């Protein structure tokens, strides 16, 4: 896991560095790490067929899942592109790639490994503090995780088999997967009782997670049975390095959290609009006195009244961009609920996007 | 036998005010002449609203509310009628619906001295004084803040004798007032962390509701109720000490000058009253 994509070859064959793969951009432009120049470069559309897309998603912790793949005009401004060759009789794609100045088709590949980031159209949903009721189907990635059939923390899905949430919910002695039970696609907490559970087979916690400063707070529940996708349950695409996330950008938070501090959890799933808070604004002497690590995100309003609460932990921080939803944050902790000068504090998924893939491939 | 108002003597006085501290002189029961006011005063421009300029000759008034204040060079254009600039929203509002004749004029820089002030009690019982500046500046508010008749900028001796981070300054407030807000909080390992009220600065307080310092706008007749005070800058740390706020905390003010072609600019909104009626008439004929 941690030996993957570090610049040092571990296995004698060197598959750790030759098969480093990630996506890029809101339009999902594929990149392949070049060991000779220590940089990421996109791939050409030229002489590429869909069988190589099977091998790319498989090495990207997505196994056989493959939604679609088409060629798009390059936008990252890269000077070099990987070029495939069909003269080689081998079956591995990475020995087939070599550097070239430009592609003949003037296009780079848009790779989609799973149909994510799409939901049913919903008009009015601001159900976290100070708002109105919600509608089903607008947040199909959102799931709830239960210990002894009562809610503890929320969750969001990215594949049929994996659920991401916060590590403080899975802290000791709750590090045993037998206690956890996940429910998917049910809005009412009075209905997730009879046979709707999805048991977690193994809990994954961050190795450098520290509870004193509550930094590196990420956790990955994996189910035995893959989730059967329909209109009520759909995944959300993992965000890529290289999007210019603007300040103040309109994001959405969700969860079964309380409507006020120290209050009981909500009967129905709540979801309301919040805004990003810039990290250099948040880690000043004023907002939290240098408590925000680079693996942490501040979101919401400094004026308050729209913020996460207890029970909102594990929920998704999602934004809309090119009609695709992106899970940029996970609710780690919150100093109060709906209060000014103390907004919701969220864990940065973006720092840990590569760490999720390291557990996806090794436990496939 | 009825005497003259000598309005020209009042504008050409050596003391020239600022838009923050504009005055008012209710001229009544005396004579004048608009020709002598136009001649003895070096007029830049002269305009009248809701009253004909040519009809001042012979027609007269019950009482004339005469206001004056100097013009900043960068704030000459904001004195447009009905504008939403800093001068018309935080220094002096001009009633457009009343009979008003505006006068623009200048006085020579040899005989002009400026007595800047800050009309208010909320911001003058709590430390203030000479507006630190040079021999020819004109203060102008850019955002007026109003507070209650109980806000003690100074915090409470006790909460702080038990705080331990963000120790915001503090002093014993005055008999009849209420301690400022402070919600002893806890974050991870930092215990008793006090985030007392109006924290950043009155103009960056993202809590326009928790900070007792609310924002407001001036009003026909009424000057600025109060300016701005960084609430983390008011008070010594010693406890047994009165609420002496300090001179370097007054934020919300700006010092633009008054010098145009080797001469200082001044304005006026002569508010009127009583057309074809009064005993303060004129000889303009
Ligand atoms: C297959 C073959 O005979 N030619 C290889 C070539 O593919 C390889 O790129 C090069 C150095 O990397 O070494 C040659 O011997
Ligand atoms: C890109 C390039 O020119 N190098 C090829 C290499 O990709 C291939 O794996 C090897 C053996 O088949 O032959 C080399 O010539
Ligand atoms: C005293 C005064 O200011 N009034 C003068 C008056 O003496 C003079 O006779 C008349 C004609 O020039 O003009 C008026 O303005
Ligand atoms: C009349 C008046 O007020 N102006 C005086 C002037 O008489 C004096 O000779 C000179 C000295 O500065 O300038 C002004 O102070
Ligand atoms: C004590 C006082 O208020 N006067 C100071 C003055 O000594 C200083 O030279 C000047 C420079 O801007 O600033 C003023 O505030
Ligand atoms: C006038 C008065 O005595 N009432 C005060 C008010 O000024 C203050 O803004 C409010 C909030 O602290 O508390 C009230 O008791």
Numbering used by the authors:
A (entry chain B): 129 to 492
B (entry chain A): 323 to 607
Paper text:
As a member of the Embecovirus, HKU1 uses a primary glycan-based receptor (9-O-acetylated sialosides) and a secondary proteinaceous receptor for host cell targeting and membrane fusion. One unique feature of HKU1 spike is that the C-terminal domain (CTD) of S1 (also known as receptor-binding domain, RBD) is exceptionally larger than other CoV RBDs, and the receptor-binding motif (RBM) of HKU1 adopts a unique fold. Proteinaceous receptor of HKU1 was identified as transmembrane serine protease 2 (TMPRSS2) and HKU1 RBD binds TMPRSS2 with nanomolar affinity. The TMPRSS2–RBD interaction occurred between a groove formed on the HKU1 RBD apex and a hydrophobic surface near the active site in the C-terminal trypsin-like serine peptidase (SP) domain of TMPRSS2.
Using bio-layer interferometry (BLI), we determined the equilibrium dissociation constant (KD) for RBD–TMPRSS2 interaction. The affinity of 1A-RBD–TMPRSS2 (KD = 323 nM) was ~2-fold lower than that of 1B-RBD–TMPRSS2 (KD = 170 nM), which is consistent with the KD values reported previously. The difference between 1A-RBD–TMPRSS2 and 1B-RBD–TMPRSS2 maps may attribute to higher binding affinity of 1B RBD for TMPRSS2 that enhances stability of the complex. Therefore, we mainly used 1B-RBD–TMPRSS2 structure for subsequent structural analysis. RBG is an arch-shaped module comprising an antiparallel β-hairpin (β10–β11, previously referred to as a horn) and a proline-rich loop; two disulfide bridges C504–C518 and C520–C533 stabilize the fold of this module. We identified 14 HKU1 spike residues and 8 TMPRSS2 residues mediating the interactions, rendering an interfacial area of 752 Å2. In particular, residues T509, L510, Y511, V512 and W515 on the β-hairpin of RBG are packed against a hydrophobic patch on TMPRSS2 formed by residues Y416, L419 and W461. Residues L521, P522, T527, Y528 and S529 from the proline-rich loop of RBG interact with a hydrophobic protrusion formed by L430, Y414 and Y469 of TMPRSS2. A π-stacking interaction is formed between TMRPSS2 R470 and 1B RBD R517. Additionally, the salt bridges between HKU1 spike D507 and TMPRSS2 R470, and between HKU1 spike D505 and TMPRSS2 K467 further stabilize the TMPRSS2–RBD interaction. Lastly, HKU1 spike K487 forms an additional salt bridge with TMPRSS2 D417, and this is the only non-RBG residue contributing to the interaction.
